[PDB]
Amino acid sequence: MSAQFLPSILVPLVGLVFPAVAMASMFLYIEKEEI
Amino acid sequence: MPIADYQVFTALFLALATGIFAVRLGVALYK
Amino acid sequence: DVAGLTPCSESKAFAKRKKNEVKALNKRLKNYEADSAPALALKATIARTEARFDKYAKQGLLCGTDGLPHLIADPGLALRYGHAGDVFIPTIGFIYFAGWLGYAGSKYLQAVAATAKPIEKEIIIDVPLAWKLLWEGFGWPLRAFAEYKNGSLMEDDAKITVSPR
Amino acid sequence: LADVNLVVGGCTVGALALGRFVFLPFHRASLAKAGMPKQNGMTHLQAGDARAEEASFILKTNDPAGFTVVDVMAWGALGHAAAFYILATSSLGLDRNPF
Amino acid sequence: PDVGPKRGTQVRILRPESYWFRETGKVVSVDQSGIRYPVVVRFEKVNYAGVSTNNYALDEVVAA
Amino acid sequence: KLFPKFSQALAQDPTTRRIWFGIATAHDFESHDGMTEERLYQKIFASHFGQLAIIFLWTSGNLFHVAWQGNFEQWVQDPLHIRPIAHAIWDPHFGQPAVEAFTRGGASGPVNISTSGVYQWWYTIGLRTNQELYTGSIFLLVLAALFLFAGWLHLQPAFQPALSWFKNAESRLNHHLAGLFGVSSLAWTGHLVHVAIPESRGQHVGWDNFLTVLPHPAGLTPFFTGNWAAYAENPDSASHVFNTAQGSGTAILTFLGGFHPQTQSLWLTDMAHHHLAIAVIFILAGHMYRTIFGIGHSMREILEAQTPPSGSLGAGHKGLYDTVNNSLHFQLGLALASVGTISSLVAQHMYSLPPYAFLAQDFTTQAALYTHHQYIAGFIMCGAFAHGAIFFVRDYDPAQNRGNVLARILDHKEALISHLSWASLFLGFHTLGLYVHNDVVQAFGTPEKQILIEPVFAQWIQAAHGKTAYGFDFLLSSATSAPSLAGQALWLPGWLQGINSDANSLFLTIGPGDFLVHHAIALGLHTTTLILVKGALDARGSKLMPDKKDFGYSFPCDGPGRGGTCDISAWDAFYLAVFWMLNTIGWVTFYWHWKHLGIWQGNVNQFNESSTYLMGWLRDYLWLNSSQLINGYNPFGMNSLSVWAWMFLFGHLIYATGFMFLISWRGYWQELIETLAWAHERTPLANLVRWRDKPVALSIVQARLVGLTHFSVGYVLTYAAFLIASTSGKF
Amino acid sequence: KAGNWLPGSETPAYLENLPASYGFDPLGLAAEPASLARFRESEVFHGRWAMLGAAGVLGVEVLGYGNWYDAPLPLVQGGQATYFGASVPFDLGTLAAIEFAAMAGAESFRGAAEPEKRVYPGGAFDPMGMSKGNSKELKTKEIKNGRLAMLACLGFAAQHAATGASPLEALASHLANPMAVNFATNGVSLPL
Amino acid sequence: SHTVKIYDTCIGCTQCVRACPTDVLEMVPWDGCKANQIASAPRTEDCVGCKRCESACPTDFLSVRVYLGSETTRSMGLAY
Ligand code: CLA
Ligand code: CLA
Ligand code: CLA
Ligand code: CLA
Ligand code: CLA
Ligand code: CLA
Ligand code: CLA
Ligand SMILES: CC1=C(/C=C/C(C)=C/C=C/C(C)=C/C=C/C=C(C)/C=C/C=C(C)/C=C/C2=C(C)CCCC2(C)C)C(C)(C)CCC1
Ligand code: SF4
């Protein structure tokens, strides 16, 4: 298919980088104490 | 004729713009 | 025939099923002296199977594409085709016996309600009274229709307790 | 299947005349009984839907029987629908008759 | 003079939130002091809590 | 401790509950602090905009992945010998053999084979190349962005619509009936005529040349001259080849009925004419209610006049307009009921009357689509009844609804509940009894003692449609009857040809097994409705809890007093009915799958003889068809069906987990967690870490929700794995 | 009243002062006053229309111009229906349109009138001045003839739908041998 | 922080106040019943929600009525 490299970069972004960052931000926000 | 790389990149960039619109609407809803 | 169902006495698959089931029992027979208790049991079983298959063919039950009897559950489409013994007649028979038991129980409840300890006459049944009411329950169509035409069968909802809406 | 002009024109003029001369009393009576829609006892205008304010070009007309332009358009729409039923059905040539 | 139903008579409960709504019960006493609910009614059948005696007012205890 | 911004009561919670309940109450706007009707309606409106953006993004993603990683161009040439590709697989845990085993439909790397039937849909509606799919994806991406911008725009006080604008029901019905339904289907007819029809006859019509192509050789003159029959002159020949111009024809609005011989689907001109008729009807219906032009209907006056004399209904429908209009849960329940029943309609028609080319030819797609829409419909029906219960608990006013049909149906709720109880008891007793009797007499080697009732009523109705197989010769099966003489020149040739052929699913032949299964389905529907209706009506108060509406829709219990009051709330009625909905839809899908699995292999006999007893279901369906599924991975390797075997065991695990929450209850867990808290506060090197939230066991209602969610997810995953791996394995 | 349809019985009280009343209301369809008023108007109008219909069905056949069932057939599958033997140059479309217009005008004028003037409007509809001299008796005659004619028109429909004959032909066929060609001999009315 | 209410159908039998394990209910003088005493719930900050009070009331329907609501450390019964 075209851009054979692209899944190899996007999949780790959405299954590892984005989940870790989103979970860290969510856990910071639910404990933000003063929003 | 498979779609070329620049089409993929234009699509991804427009998706980023749409994501920006989405986050604006989300923070509006949270308010 | 009522709906593409040839009478089992005509269907070849029905007779084929008869044949195969009997042949299985014959194969089971061919292992014992034809005078031993197992042999007598097998012979009685084969006689019972043959009698059943002849009885089913005699009564004109309907067999399908496979060789299995089918029943008809519509009055009129079973009464004009000679198949009222399939569902309609047993319907009458059940409805009668079920109503008999239900009416006997209902009248026993209404008879022991007006006593000293009605909650006692349910765990320690009065057998003579139960038996008398069980005998009187046979006329339940008559007595039940009398009570409906009388209005004493049912109770007006103004007296039955209800939930707070 | 004989002249679109005659059938559609005659049907529409007939429907206009039938809604202006014949069905108008019952139409006005039913409209007076029904009235504007109400939510919780007040019209949509009183509740605050200023777009539910009645169109001004229908409140006062000049027809002596009160036949407004929107009435004209509804009755003309019915007339055209009936006329084109006539045309499209006469255009076909098939045995629909259950006999 | 005595107020409310007589002692020993049968009454029909009319409190919609009571377990014995529209069911009969016998009066075992009627207090004369001035309580809100002085009528004391005894039923044969128990409720969910296992009790069979309840106090009702006078407007919600139609006799017979 | 300020995460639940919308609920001050939960913010002050010192435990972990504040998180859990802080998530599950995020969309219940009516329960939020400081909430007005205006603000509620505005927030809801913006949330709807977000939902449409989500839907458009999801469909754009489907299109993009098929255009990018799918083999659509290849599939167009050989629609019957190519497996449609969904998306590519990029997983760094795969071994080499799995990469070998997942390279299938000709793609360069591992891929997923699509079972959604989008290839058939896009092929049927005119899309032929991948550039068109990409153009659709880009257009839909932009459209989702536009809907997002509108959703933000109308949240603004310069553009925020007033509450009285939302409650304007006559204008909304006018615009949804005439505009959202009428003009939308009119434009779909325009697409079909201008694009899908010519693209079905080899001609290419696109944005480049659609203004230079006549959809009809005498365009627009028959339409405006009333000579409309000229648009159905020469239809598609019975030897037409789809996508090509071998006996194509010029008719655009035909009414042939039946099926296309090659695609085994509905004629496309039939669907174009369908949507034209639908458009006209829906526009006419959209001109019914009164807006600002002095004509139309006031729905309130219609409701106020539907009161029968003699007072059989009481006050009739007096006060129903305000009841529906003011309550959003009443409207939500009505919409959910309609949408769920229409989902069931979609599932039940799309298999018997397949509308897409080379659909029904592909078997896994049929089963997947049917089961998908059936499960969706079951869930939506449970939701409709849940929101009816919520309406009764929350928005029901006895004073306004006094004497109307709503009050009258609350008045005699015991009759309804008792008669549902009788119907369900009868159906269960008797269907189980017949199954057990057949099963026992089969067990004793005498299958001829089986009670095999014939479905003569359903067979009679089938015969009324022109099925000349049961010899009823009734309505359309009698070539001499009035309905037969009427339609013999319009629609009846093709329709009768389709119905009388056993090559399709149009009106399958039914025997005693169909009778037994339909009565099982009846038992399921009646018992699920019993649970839901009882919980909806018995929601304002019972004899056990006469003041239940004082506690709300959801609450645990009422203590252990008065004998015990577990699962007493209406939410618990919804909870208990979800299980029955799952079971009933499982029966429906089991029946459909086995009937059609017998159909597709030509072996109708297996079902027709083995479906009258339950061991036939256990052995000839579940056990027999599970051979390839459980052999997906084994000590000798694996194949493409390894993912479905893993998903099979995965669903089993999830469902078995859900039993833990369903059986064990909060009280063992609290003491256990509390001993664990002692262990943690009290061990070296870990005292340096403390919890910000006091760890407490899940609440009662929350645990019921968790167990039910696990149960449903496991049920769905297990059946989906079995269905896909049992249909795609054999076909 | 005068009459009682079930001699030994009790009649509903709302059916007394009405002309041609027999107490016949076993379903209580007139238990309400407004409903009974509408029903009375509708009964009289139905009686009039059915008298005209029965008279037409009999007079097209006794005069000899085909039966009522085959009268509209020639208009389809050809054209120019026949009246008195003549031929109208009108098609079904113009017939339907002219009837719709005329009947709309007539029944819109009738429907907008007063309650009693919607059923018994003498005025110019009694040129022979017969409504005088106590019309109550005349109203009873009209109602009873209307009831007979209504039942006769329903009989025309059902007899033609069952045996496929024509009114006078069915009459003659029954008269020829009543004990063996009544409704109990066709295979339709009696499912035997 | 559960909402405990006492209604006038109370007969002052003292069962609800002996039942409670956290001392939330109490006896106060009254005059609308023969015992001349009614229950009251002053210390409702201590209500855990056990509904032992509500399971001991003999009146039909119940006079002491508990409505579980917001949860705190005292209401959730946490020792850790
Ligand atoms: C909402 C529909 C949808 C879904 C379910 C998926 C699913 C998937 N995509 Mg995809 N994508 C979509 C839309 C969607 N996409 C659209 C519209 C585009 C056009 C720009 C793309 C472009 C795209 C590319 C280029 C790639 C994928 C890839 C993938 C796969 C890996 C996920 C990933 O890491 O990529 C990340 C996905 C993105 C960076 C953009 C997707 C953004 C969508 C619209 C998110 C929408 C949010 C959703 C509706 C709401 C869920 C709530 C959530 C926010 C918590 C995965 C199966 C990768 C793949 O092929 O794996 C092999 C890959 O490289 N997608
Ligand atoms: C003689 C006693 C009696 C009678 C007259 C009835 C009558 C009725 N029952 Mg009922 N029932 C009974 C006992 C009885 N029941 C018992 C003991 C139970 C506990 C298992 C139930 C549980 C029950 C349920 C759950 C339901 C009914 C329902 C109904 C109604 C529908 C008819 C039906 O098919 O019910 C079905 C009958 C059964 C399910 C079991 C019958 C029990 C046995 C067979 C009868 C008992 C006979 C007694 C022990 C013998 C005494 C004889 C005397 C000489 C001592 C009907 C009015 C249904 C309803 O709601 O009304 C619409 C309903 O859903 N019943
Ligand atoms: C012409 C005027 C018009 C139009 C086009 C719309 C259109 C719309 N309105 Mg709106 N509205 C209008 C006027 C209009 N409105 C007016 C005048 C008012 C004030 C009274 C409102 C007040 C209003 C509110 C308060 C809301 C909307 C909402 C919506 C959206 C409905 C949700 C949806 O998209 O589902 C689409 C539904 C369909 C397309 C019809 C589906 C038909 C059935 C279900 C299925 C049949 C189709 C077929 C079988 C499926 C096969 C296709 C398959 C192959 C894919 C929709 C886009 C809602 C919304 O979403 O907010 C943005 C909402 O909250 N409107
Ligand atoms: C709304 C959908 C739609 C749209 C946008 C179009 C658009 C077009 N059609 Mg088409 N068409 C449609 C539906 C549609 N059609 C349907 C449903 C059918 C029958 C099944 C046809 C059959 C058809 C034929 C046979 C032909 C066209 C042709 C054309 C093109 C020439 C313009 C024209 O027709 O002359 C101008 C139109 C008029 C002078 C009068 C039309 C006004 C109508 C009667 C009322 C409009 C109100 C309407 C409800 C508004 C809806 C709003 C919506 C458009 C958003 C044009 C681009 C012609 C062509 O050249 O092909 C390229 C051609 O011959 N169409
Ligand atoms: C148009 C559809 C629709 C809409 C708008 C609503 C709207 C609403 N519902 Mg409702 N409902 C619906 C359909 C709908 N419902 C259906 C179809 C059902 C049947 C299941 C229900 C059953 C239902 C109940 C029982 C309740 C509501 C409630 C509510 C209100 C609050 C929702 C909430 O608490 O958010 C919170 C959302 C969640 C907690 C999501 C829970 C997580 C889901 C259920 C499962 C997640 C597992 C996941 C899918 C697994 C991943 C798969 C993978 C691992 C394989 C709200 C106004 C509540 C209410 O009104 O309060 C009185 C209420 O108790 N609904
Ligand atoms: C295989 C499991 C199973 C079975 C058989 C049932 C069966 C039943 N459920 Mg149930 N249900 C189940 C699972 C099951 N459920 C689960 C997992 C849930 C989620 C908690 C529910 C939740 C649920 C609810 C909420 C309701 C039911 C109801 C019912 C009854 C519906 C009426 C009926 O169908 O009559 C048919 C009767 C039968 C099928 C029972 C068989 C008769 C027996 C076997 C004959 C006795 C033979 C012999 C004498 C047995 C004793 C021998 C032994 C002592 C030695 C029925 C008895 C509804 C109800 O109460 O009905 C009014 C009700 O509302 N169910
Ligand atoms: C398949 C269903 C199921 C499962 C998985 C469990 C699991 C468990 N039960 Mg349970 N139970 C069940 C059914 C189940 N039960 C049912 C039906 C009942 C009703 C009788 C009970 C009643 C019950 C009681 C009374 C108790 C338990 C206890 C436990 C826990 C014991 C600790 C353990 O087993 O070690 C480890 C856990 C597992 C092996 C679960 C599988 C997890 C996998 C193998 C590894 C996890 C890594 C994961 C895959 C990666 C994360 C992925 C990422 C996306 C998050 C455990 C988590 C006991 C407890 O609380 O602890 C002592 C306890 O006393 N159960
Ligand atoms: C609880 C509640 C609720 C909810 C409810 C629901 C959910 C309901 C439903 C239901 C449903 C979901 C239903 C359904 C239905 C349907 C029907 C009932 C129908 C029908 C039809 C017919 C009758 C047909 C006919 C025909 C035929 C026969 C065939 C051909 C065609 C025709 C058309 C002819 C509410 C809130 C609202 C209220 C209160 C509470
Ligand atoms: S066991 Fe649980 S649900 Fe049942 S009464 Fe006790 S606390 Fe409530």
Going from the C-alpha of F423 to that of each of C91, F427, H61, the distances in angstroms are 17, 6, 33
* Nearest-atom index, ligand 9, CA of F666: 2
Specify the experimental method. cryo-EM
Contact D26 G73 (CB under 8 A): no
- Are F251 and F230 in contact by the 8 Å Cβ rule? The answer is no
Q: How would you write B1-31 as a 3-class SS string?
A: CCCCHHHHHHHHHHHHHHHHHHHHHHHHHHC
G174 is in an annotated binding site: yes
What is the spatial distance between Cα D70 and Cα F296, in angstroms, rounded to a whole number? 11
Distance from CA of A9 to the nearest CA of B (A): 13
Task: Give Cα A16 to chain centroid, integer Å.
Answer: 6
Can you give F409-450 as a three-state secondary structure string? HHHCHHHHHHHHHHHHHHHHHHHHHHHHHHHHHHHCCCHHHC
Kindly provide the b/e burial profile for residues C115-133, where b requires at least 16 CB atoms within 10 angstroms of the residue's own CB. eeeeeebeeeeeeeebeeb
Q: Does H9 touch chain E (CB under 8 A)?
A: yes
Closest CA to F101 of F643, F645, F730: F643
Q: Residue type at F536? A: A
Bridge partners of H29, per DSSP, are: H37
- DSSP labels for F210-232? GGG--SSTTTTHHHHHT-GGGGG
Q: Whose CA is nearest to atom 19 of ligand 7?
A: F660
Question: Cis peptide leading into H61, omega within 30 of 0?
Answer: yes
Contact residues, chain E, for C164 at CB < 8 Å: 16-17
Q: Which strand (E) or helix (H) includes residue E40?
A: strand E39-42
Distance CA F238, CA F247 (A): 8
This PDB structure is determined at a resolution in Å of 4.2
Does F48 contact ligand 3 (Cβ within 6 A)? yes
Residue of A nearest to F691 (CA): A31
Using the mean position of ligand 8's atoms as its centre, give its distance from the Cα of residue F453 in Å: 29
Q: Ligand 9 pocket, F452 CB below 6 A? A: no
CB E60 within 8 A of CB E13: yes
Backbone torsion region of residue G85, taken as left when φ is above 0, otherwise alpha when ψ lies between -120 and 50, otherwise beta: left
Contact at CB, F538 and C72, closer than 8 angstroms:
no
> D84: number of CA atoms within 13 Å, CB side?
13
Q: Which atom of ligand 2 is nearest to the CA of F426?
A: 34
Nearest one of F582, F614, F609, F524 to F714, comparing CA atoms? F582
Contacts of F561 in chain E (CB under 8 A): 49
Evaluate whether F360 touches F264 at the Cβ level (below 8 Å): yes
Residue from F654, F657, F660 whose mutation best tests the ligand 7 pocket (most atoms within 8 A of CB): F660
Other Cβ atoms closer than 10 A to F57: 21
- Give the H or E element holding residue G169: helix G167-176
Chain F residues 210-239 with CB within 8 Å of chain D: 224-230
- Ligand 1 site-directed mutation target among F64, F91, F102, F135, most atoms within 8 Å of CB: F64
B5, A2: Cβ pair inside 8 Å? yes
**H helices present in A1-35, as ranges:** 5-12, 18-30
Measure the CA–CA gap between F539 and F545, rounded to whole angstroms. 10
How far from F457 is each of F430, F586, F591, CA to CA, in Å? 18, 25, 19
Q: State the Cα angle at C37 between C34 and C40, rounded to 5°.
A: 55
Give F497-503's long-range contacts (Cβ < 8 A, gap of 24+). Answer: F497/F258, F498/F257, F498/F258, F498/F259, F499/F465, F499/F466, F499/F467, F500/F466, F500/F467, F500/F468, F500/F469, F503/F264
HSE (CB half, 13 Å, CA atoms) of F196?
24
Query: Which candidate from D41, D47, D91 shows the least CB-CB separation from F226?
Result: D91
Collect all residues with Cβ–Cβ distance below 8 Å to E18 and sequence separation of at least 6. Answer: E54, E56, H60, H61
Asked if residues H57 and H5 have their Cβ atoms less than 8 Å apart, the reply is no
Quick one: tokens of B1?
């004729």
| H or E element in which residue F55 lies | helix F37-69
Tokens (6 digits) for F523? 């038992």
CA distance D38 to D29: 18
CA–CA dist F300, F167 (Å, integer): 13
Residue pair F557/F666 in contact (Cβ under 8 Å)? The answer is no
Within 13 Å and on the Cβ side, how many CA atoms surround G140?
A: 13
* Residue H79, φ and ψ in degrees, nearest 5: -95, -20
Q: How far is CA F471 from CA C42, D68, E6, F483, G187, in A?
A: 43, 60, 76, 18, 19
Instruction: Name which of A9, A23, A29, A30 to mutate to probe chain F: the one with the most chain F Cβ atoms within 10 A of its Cβ.
Output: A30
Q: Whose CA is nearest to atom 6 of ligand 1?
A: F61
Q: Burial code of G132-168, b = ≥16 C-beta within 10 A, e = fewer?
A: eeebeeebbebbebbbebbebbeebeebbeebebbbe
E-assigned strand segments in D1-90: 38-39, 42-43
Chain F residues closer than 8 Å to B26 by CB: 50
d(CA C78, CA C81): 5
Residue F449 amino acid letter: K
User: For residues F323 and F217, what is the distance between their CA atoms, to the nearest angstrom?
Assistant: 55
Return the best residue to mutate from F566, F575, F662 for the ligand 9 pocket (most ligand atoms within 8 A of CB). Answer: F566
To the nearest whole angstrom, how far is the Cα of G188 from the nearest Cα of chain F? Answer: 14
Q: How far is CA F469 from CA C5, C128, F557, F610, in A?
A: 11, 59, 57, 22
Distance CA F549, CA F553 (A): 7
CA distance F677 to F695: 8
Give the tokens for residue F78. Answer: 């050989």
Q: CA angle, H5 as apex, H3 and H6 as ends, to 5°? A: 165
Cα three-residue angle G166-G172-G177, rounded to 5 degrees? 130
- G112 to D90: CB separation less than 8 angstroms, yes or no: no
Cα separation, D16 vs G47, in Å, equals 33
Q: Where are the domains of chain D?
A: 1-99
Residue pair F13/F3 in contact (Cβ under 8 Å)? The answer is no
Binding residues of D for chlorophyll a: 20, 61-63
Tally of domains in chain H: 1
Structure tokens belonging to residue D59 = 């409140």
How many angstroms separate the CA atoms of F569 and F547, rounded?
11
At G93, is the secondary structure helix, strand, or coil? helix
Q: For residues F212 and F189, what is the distance between their CA atoms, to the nearest angstrom? A: 19
Q: Is G32 on the interface with F (CB under 8 A)?
A: yes
Range of the domain at H30: 1-80
Answer yes or no: is the C-beta of F479 below 6 A from any ligand 9 atom.
no
Q: Given an 8 Å threshold on Cβ–Cβ distance, is D97 in contact with G97?
A: no
Q: Which residues contact A1 (CB under 8 A, 6 or more apart)?
A: B2, F68, F69, F88, F107, F108, F109
Rounded CA gap, F595 and F513, in Å?
10
Structure tokens that stand for F406 in this block: 């709503």
Structure tokens at F701: 């209602």
Any binding-site annotation on G118? no
HSE of C165, CA atoms in CB hemisphere, 13 A: 13
Q: How far apart are the first and last CA of chain D?
A: 24
Sign of CA dihedral F686, F691, F696, F701: negative
The answer to whether F116 touches F124, Cβ cutoff 8 Å, is: no
Please list every protein residue whose CB sits less than 6 Å from any atom of ligand 1. Answer: A 6-7, 10-11, 14-15; B 11-12, 15; F 54, 57-58, 60-61, 64, 87-88, 90, 141
Dihedral of alpha carbons D31, D33, D37, D43, sign: positive
> Domain-by-domain residue ranges, chain C?
1-165
- F165 vs F41: CA distance, rounded Å: 10
- Separation in Å, CA of A26 to nearest CA in chain B: 14
- In 10 A of CB E23, how many CB atoms? 17
3-class secondary structure per residue, C35-58: CCHHHHHHHHHHHHHHHHHHHHHH
Atom of ligand 6 nearest to the CA of F424: 32
DSSP state of F622: I
